[PDB]
Short mmCIF file of all heavy atoms in Angstrom, two decimals:
data_model
loop_
_atom_site.label_atom_id
_atom_site.label_comp_id
_atom_site.label_asym_id
_atom_site.label_seq_id
_atom_site.Cartn_x
_atom_site.Cartn_y
_atom_site.Cartn_z
N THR B 46 41.57 88.24 73.59
CA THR B 46 41.59 87.35 74.74
C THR B 46 41.37 88.15 76.01
O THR B 46 41.24 89.38 75.99
CB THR B 46 42.92 86.58 74.81
OG1 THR B 46 44.00 87.51 74.87
CG2 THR B 46 43.09 85.70 73.59
N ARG B 47 41.31 87.44 77.13
CA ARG B 47 41.29 88.11 78.42
C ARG B 47 42.56 88.93 78.60
O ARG B 47 43.65 88.49 78.25
CB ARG B 47 41.13 87.09 79.55
CG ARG B 47 42.37 86.26 79.86
CD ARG B 47 42.54 85.15 78.84
NE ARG B 47 43.54 84.16 79.24
CZ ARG B 47 43.95 83.17 78.47
NH1 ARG B 47 43.48 82.99 77.25
NH2 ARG B 47 44.86 82.32 78.94
N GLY B 48 42.39 90.15 79.11
CA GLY B 48 43.53 91.01 79.38
C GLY B 48 44.39 91.30 78.17
O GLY B 48 45.62 91.27 78.26
N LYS B 51 41.19 95.15 74.84
CA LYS B 51 39.95 95.48 74.14
C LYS B 51 39.29 96.74 74.69
O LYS B 51 39.13 97.73 73.97
CB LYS B 51 38.97 94.32 74.24
CG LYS B 51 39.24 93.19 73.28
CD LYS B 51 38.89 91.86 73.91
CE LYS B 51 37.41 91.77 74.24
NZ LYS B 51 37.14 90.75 75.28
N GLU B 127 31.57 91.89 76.55
CA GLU B 127 31.15 90.50 76.36
C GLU B 127 29.85 90.44 75.56
O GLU B 127 28.85 89.84 75.99
CB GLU B 127 31.02 89.77 77.70
CG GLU B 127 32.20 90.00 78.63
CD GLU B 127 33.49 89.39 78.11
OE1 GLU B 127 33.42 88.36 77.41
OE2 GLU B 127 34.57 89.95 78.41
N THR B 157 35.24 88.22 74.34
CA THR B 157 36.42 87.35 74.42
C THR B 157 36.39 86.28 73.33
O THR B 157 37.42 86.01 72.70
CB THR B 157 36.51 86.71 75.80
OG1 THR B 157 36.38 87.72 76.81
CG2 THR B 157 37.84 86.01 75.97
N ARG B 215 47.05 91.80 81.54
CA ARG B 215 46.43 91.93 82.85
C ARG B 215 46.89 90.82 83.78
O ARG B 215 47.13 91.06 84.97
CB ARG B 215 44.91 91.92 82.73
CG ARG B 215 44.21 92.32 84.02
CD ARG B 215 42.80 91.75 84.12
NE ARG B 215 41.82 92.61 83.48
CZ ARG B 215 41.09 92.25 82.43
NH1 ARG B 215 41.17 91.04 81.91
NH2 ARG B 215 40.25 93.14 81.89
N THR E 165 38.76 85.17 82.70
CA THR E 165 38.67 86.62 82.77
C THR E 165 38.60 87.12 84.21
O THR E 165 39.32 88.05 84.59
CB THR E 165 37.47 87.12 81.95
OG1 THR E 165 37.36 88.54 82.07
CG2 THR E 165 36.17 86.45 82.39
N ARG E 169 41.71 89.24 87.11
CA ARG E 169 41.59 90.40 87.98
C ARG E 169 41.43 90.01 89.45
O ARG E 169 40.58 90.52 90.17
CB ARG E 169 40.42 91.26 87.51
CG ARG E 169 39.10 90.51 87.48
CD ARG E 169 38.01 91.31 86.81
NE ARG E 169 38.25 91.48 85.38
CZ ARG E 169 37.57 92.30 84.60
NH1 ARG E 169 36.60 93.07 85.08
NH2 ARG E 169 37.85 92.35 83.30
F1 BEF F 3 38.28 91.83 80.06
BE1 BEF F 3 38.96 90.60 79.41
F2 BEF F 3 38.10 89.94 78.29
F3 BEF F 3 39.52 89.58 80.43
#
Side-chain angles (χ1 to χ4, degrees):
Chain B
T46 57
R47 74 281 192 186
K51 281 145 63 201
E127 314 293 329
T157 310
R215 191 205 273 117
Chain E
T165 178
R169 58 189 68 191

